Amino acid sequence: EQGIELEHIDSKSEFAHRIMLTNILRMMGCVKKQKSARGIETRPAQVI
Amino acid sequence: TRGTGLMSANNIIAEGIEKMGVRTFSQKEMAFNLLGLLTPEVVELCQKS
Amino acid sequence: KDTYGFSILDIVINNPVNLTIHFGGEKGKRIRENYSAMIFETTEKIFKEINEHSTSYTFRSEKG
Ligand SMILES: NC(=O)C1=CN([C@@H]2O[C@H](COP(=O)(O)OP(=O)(O)OC[C@H]3O[C@@H](n4cnc5c(N)ncnc54)[C@H](OP(=O)(O)O)[C@@H]3O)[C@@H](O)[C@H]2O)C=CC1
């Protein structure tokens, strides 16, 4: 996001915030749900 | 980090920044630092908290 | 499940060919300890590969 100040935050900024925050939270949740549905409590995934 | 992605375009001032005793990293260096977090001891440390 | 990290019912029902036990986290470390404490005094340790750096162990077979 280049040259997008506060007054310019628009569709593209929302899509980037989705990518970089909300879908990373969703991917973490998906991994959790997959390991819980299989009873995996002793092989945690490290999130960098 | 100097190189591409988002931090490129700033490579011409990296030397000026480093003149203040700061360190800028190449992508290999930053990758080495990040892979340092996947070492067995850091993994256990993350499992603790 | 609490002591050795596997369910006997799962083995009886599905007959897996291989089973890996993972030692991540506190619970995993406790299970690893239970695995390491086993001996065959006659004092050889059973599971001689398991040590304080093992992250997992794998029971293996051919048919089940
Ligand atoms: N100095 C730095 O570089 C710093 C970086 N960071 C962060 O660390 C991370 C390092 O990445 P970096 O290489 O620097 O940044 P880049 O922007 O180069 O990396 C992002 C990459 O993600 C891929 N991508 C883009 N959009 C999507 C999408 N919608 N879906 C899937 N993949 C996509 C692209 O590669 P492709 O199209 O080939 O898949 C792109 O090259 C970034 O998240 C950055 O914000 C933080 C602080 C400083």
Swiss-Prot record, chain A:
4'-phosphopantetheine is transferred from CoA to a specific serine of the Acyl carrier domain by the C-terminal PPT domain. This modification is essential for activity because fatty acids are bound in thioester linkage to the sulfhydryl of the prosthetic group. Belongs to the thiolase-like superfamily. Fungal fatty acid synthetase subunit alpha family. [Alpha(6)beta(6)] hexamers of two multifunctional subunits (alpha and beta). Fatty acid synthetase catalyzes the formation of long-chain fatty acids from acetyl-CoA, malonyl-CoA and NADPH. The alpha subunit contains domains for: acyl carrier protein, 3-oxoacyl-[acyl-carrier-protein] reductase, and 3-oxoacyl-[acyl-carrier-protein] synthase. This subunit coordinates the binding of the six beta subunits to the enzyme complex. Present with 17000 molecules/cell in log phase SD medium. This is Fatty acid synthase subunit alpha. The chain holds residues 776 to 823 of 1887 of the full protein.
From Swiss-Prot, chain B:
4'-phosphopantetheine is transferred from CoA to a specific serine of the Acyl carrier domain by the C-terminal PPT domain. This modification is essential for activity because fatty acids are bound in thioester linkage to the sulfhydryl of the prosthetic group. It comes from the Eukaryota. Fatty acid synthetase catalyzes the formation of long-chain fatty acids from acetyl-CoA, malonyl-CoA and NADPH. The alpha subunit contains domains for: acyl carrier protein, 3-oxoacyl-[acyl-carrier-protein] reductase, and 3-oxoacyl-[acyl-carrier-protein] synthase. This subunit coordinates the binding of the six beta subunits to the enzyme complex. Belongs to the thiolase-like superfamily. Fungal fatty acid synthetase subunit alpha family. Present with 17000 molecules/cell in log phase SD medium. [Alpha(6)beta(6)] hexamers of two multifunctional subunits (alpha and beta). This is Fatty acid synthase subunit alpha. It comes from Saccharomyces cerevisiae (strain ATCC 204508 / S288c). The lineage of its organism: Eukaryota, Fungi, Dikarya, Ascomycota, Saccharomycotina. The chain holds residues 872 to 920 of 1887 of the full protein.
Curated annotation (Swiss-Prot), chain C:
Present with 91800 molecules/cell in log phase SD medium. Belongs to the fungal fatty acid synthetase subunit beta family. Fatty acid synthetase catalyzes the formation of long-chain fatty acids from acetyl-CoA, malonyl-CoA and NADPH. The beta subunit contains domains for: [acyl-carrier-protein] acetyltransferase and malonyltransferase, S-acyl fatty acid synthase thioesterase, enoyl-[acyl-carrier-protein] reductase, and 3-hydroxypalmitoyl-[acyl-carrier-protein] dehydratase. [Alpha(6)beta(6)] hexamers of two multifunctional subunits (alpha and beta). This is Fatty acid synthase subunit beta. It comes from Saccharomyces cerevisiae (strain ATCC 204508 / S288c) (Baker's yeast). The lineage of its organism: Eukaryota, Fungi, Dikarya, Ascomycota, Saccharomycotina.
